Amino acid sequence: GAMERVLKVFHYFENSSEPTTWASIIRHGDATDVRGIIQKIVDCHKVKNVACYGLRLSHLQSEEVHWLHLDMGVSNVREKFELAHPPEEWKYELRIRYLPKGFLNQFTEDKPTLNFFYQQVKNDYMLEIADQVDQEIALKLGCLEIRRSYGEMRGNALEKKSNYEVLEKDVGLRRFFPKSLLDSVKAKTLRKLIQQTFRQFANLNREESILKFFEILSPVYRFDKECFKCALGSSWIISVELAIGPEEGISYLTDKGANPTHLADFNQVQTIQYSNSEDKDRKGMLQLKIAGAPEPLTVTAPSLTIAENMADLIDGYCRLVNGATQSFIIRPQKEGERALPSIPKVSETDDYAEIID
């Protein structure tokens, strides 16, 4: 629009508000790209690992997700998805998506990022598995968040009923523990289990609490890779599940619980070329030219949305491991080749992004 260019971006940089509420309001221009939106948010929190962050668009009433590539124009994206469904039904969310090898060690030297990643993974934990994990695991993770959140509290404070009551009655234990834990244990017993569990973590500082949380969660929940149902090959097409992450590089899965089988490291990917089959129901294809392999790795995704999301992921990792700011995706030249959509074809410039605090 003209004055409709105000974008709300939800994020995981903590403040005193409601977590479901953490967001920045950004006024942008007609030429601002995703890269500019990301940069402005993360520089405001003094992030070092800028290359880790992406922007995910989801429809509040679908499981569908759109990862917005850094070079996509904001107004282009908004106009395209506002043709599908109106503005109020979309959520734009800043997320860490491209993890360096050894990400935890690296994030320890960038506290805003370590904290953001923690809040991100905690949110997904509480939403997707906290009601199902072992109650001992849910007790410990909840106790760690208490320890981290109330950093100045003396380590034995929760032994006092009057202190525990503030968490139970005023704050709400739902902030830290799943409904199923709270609905299934008597209140007095829950109090005792919390007080006791908390003792093993009572002397941990905020960073140590965060690192302990990841240590305890990693066994029961993978938050360091994404998986895609797709198919590999150019002649014979074999259906697979790809597992993409810092430990896997690009891998494929075989048996439930077996180590993934390695295909390629991110640092061997030279180019990424996107194409669409010419079928009435067009297929999304990615060709990855891999250093040392004469044939490209060809991936056929079940939809164009999925292929675009996979391209964002793989390109993000290429940029990250090579320390590059530019994309490795190459321009379409032949029949059926495609670019990713919505790329365009002191603060009065039309790419300005400004946070409205």
Numbering used by the authors: 31 to 375, 391 to 402
Quoted passage from the original study:
Focal Adhesion Kinase (FAK) is a 125 kDa non-receptor tyrosine kinase that has multiple implications in cancer cell signaling, invasion, proliferation, and metastasis. Activation of FAK occurs not only through autophosphorylation of key residue tyrosine 397 (Y397) by FAK itself via the kinase enzyme, but also through transphosphorylation by receptor tyrosine kinases which can bind to the FAK N-terminal FERM domain directly. The proto-oncogene Src directly binds to FAK through its SH2 and SH3 domains at phosphorylated FAK Y397 and a proline-rich region in the FERM-Kinase linker, respectively. FAK also functions as an intracellular scaffolding protein through its FERM domain and C-terminal FAT domain regions where FAK forms multiple protein-protein interactions to connect oncogenic signaling pathways.
